Write a protein that binds this DNA or RNA. Structure first.
Ligand code: MG
Ligand code: MG
Ligand code: MG
Ligand code: MG
Ligand code: MG
Ligand code: MG
Ligand code: MG
Ligand code: MG
Ligand code: MG
Ligand code: MG
Ligand code: MG
Length: 115
RNA sequence: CAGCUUAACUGUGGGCGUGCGGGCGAUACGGGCAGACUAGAGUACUGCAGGGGAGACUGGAAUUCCUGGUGUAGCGGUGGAAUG
């Protein structure tokens, strides 16, 4: 089909980073990830896979005909700016930037400290 | 001091003998007794800040889960990987 506007969702952890593009109504057009790009071990952790998923989702969404996108990012830093710049260079221009990160107001208890 | 020749020893009466008694005469501090005062203490008049304590009521973000859409091959993980 086609869509004149949508939002690309970004959630990036230390060891992963996925990208999914959704319309405002909540129906997803397409998604991409480093794992699908084919990176295992620490390879996937790179922002490089971030830009790869970036232009991948760009292609698989612009096939459906996405024009305007607003990206939301979350999670700890793994290349957020790198991925957004790669997407911008991919040919899609964002109208507004927004970060909504899961920040629980001291709900539940995090797992023990690493050792 | 006194003599056994000096010798241990004792011949010698004083002196020593740290505790306990009543009678004569003290009152400074150290108790009880005695009435009064307040520099401690305590309440009394008005203000104060506070996650002090107990019960109940209530909001938010989030994890997880159930249900339902969009949606595609992996998601997740560590120095890496498989159990998942
Ligand atoms: Mg990792
Ligand atoms: Mg863990
Ligand atoms: Mg003599
Ligand atoms: Mg004598
Ligand atoms: Mg004695
Ligand atoms: Mg007394
Ligand atoms: Mg008086
Ligand atoms: Mg007083
Ligand atoms: Mg107060
Ligand atoms: Mg109680
Ligand atoms: Mg569902």
């Amino acid at each position: 089909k086609n869509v004149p506007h949508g939002a690309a969702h970004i959630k990036s952890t230390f060891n992963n980073t996925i990208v999914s593009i959704t319309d405002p109504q909540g129906n997803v057009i397409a998604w991409a990830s480093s794992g699908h790009v084919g990176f295992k071990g620490s390879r996937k952790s790179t922002p490089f896979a971030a830009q790869l998923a970036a232009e991948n989702a760009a292609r698989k969404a612009q096939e459906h005909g996405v024009k305007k996108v607003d990206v939301f990012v979350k999670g700890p830093g793994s290349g957020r700016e790198t991925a957004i710049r790669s997407l911008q260079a991919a040919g899609l221009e964002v109208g507004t930037i927004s970060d909504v990160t899961p920040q629980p107001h001291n709900g539940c208890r995090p797992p023990k400290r690493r050792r």
